[PDB]
Design a binder for these strands. Structure first.
Length: 265
DNA sequence: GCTGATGCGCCGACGGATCC
DNA sequence: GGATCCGTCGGGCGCATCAGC
């Protein structure tokens, strides 16, 4: 079945208007994503904060169009395997890289700490599943020592469909990367240990067919055969500020679609 | 400097057993 | 004997590297 994303809710349950728009997008090759007009979609989206994953591009190789973004001038970049980026209208107080460089950017703002993550894939044949489980454990601990200080927002490709609702084909993908019990359990452990909450599922717990990733192969996107691998996870103190978590199914330029968070801060 | 090849990383389609 | 479940496998796309030239 096809998915139509509900309209943007820009008011919090407590009555507070949205003041912060965060966009997250695994661009699957920043240079290719730009040739596919992905920046033009970002300009239409007008995010205060843009988090990019799978850049596969060093900073010295970034197209000059990224430095021609007047509303996203504060740019933080890591480094054809991974690569993450954080672009912000306002300068964050503190920026760090890693979980204690290429998969994690931590940006501290006045009322919140933003973490963007390109979580390592378990691999075809699950060759890197054990490293992912150790990675998952290292990230969870690192995030626990960040949430204690200030509210946390975590965005990006977590390389996991938490539940059967997060993918079109749960039964045949239970031994595939993204739907292993090991990865699903790691996500549940991040939600309970930090603690954090799945923004989209908190808002839409019974909504199926909502995916953020489709294989370029076998025309998967045109058939909505996909997976929800991209998330906005929020500390429970920030749930009162949650106005919406959106899935931008129509934006192209990658096998991953953009996700957008509206916060009332 | 540029093009095309190859390598590497990153599951939906379909064939074949099997069992109500 | 057809629904279903598992196992097997070609393939889209980006980028690095290489070779040619």
């Amino acid at each position: 079945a096809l998915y139509e994303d509900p309209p943007d809710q820009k008011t919090s349950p407590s009555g507070k208007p949205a003041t912060l728009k965060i966009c997250s997008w695994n661009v699957d090759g920043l240079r290719a994503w730009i040739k596919k007009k992905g920046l033009d979609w970002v300009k239409e989206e007008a995010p205060d904060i843009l988090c990019l994953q799978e850049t596969k591009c060093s900073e010295n190789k970034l197209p000059a169009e990224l430095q021609e973004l007047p509303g996203l001038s504060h740019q933080y970049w890591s480094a054809g395997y991974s690569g993450v980026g954080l672009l912000s209208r306002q300068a964050p107080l503190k920026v760090s890289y890693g979980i204690g460089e290429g998969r994690v950017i931590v940006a501290e703002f006045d009322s919140f700490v933003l973490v963007t993550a390109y979580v390592p894939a378990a691999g075809r044949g699950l060759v890197r599943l054990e490293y992912r489980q150790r990675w998952d454990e290292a990230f969870r601990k690192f995030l626990k020592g960040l949430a204690s200080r200030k509210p946390l927002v975590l965005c990006g490709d977590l390389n996991v469909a938490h539940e059967e609702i997060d993918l079109r084909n749960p039964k045949g993908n239970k031994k595939n990367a993204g739907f292993t019990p090991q990865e699903r359990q790691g996500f549940g452990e991040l939600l309970q240990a930090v603690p954090l909450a799945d923004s989209f599922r908190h808002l839409y717990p019974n909504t199926p067919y909502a995916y953020t990733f489709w294989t370029y192969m076998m025309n998967a996107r045109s058939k909505n055969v996909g997976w929800r691998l991209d998330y906005f996870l929020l500390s429970h103190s920030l749930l009162p500020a949650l106005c919406d978590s959106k899935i931008r199914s129509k934006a192209l330029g990658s096998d991953h679609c953009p996700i957008t968070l509206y916060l009332a801060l």
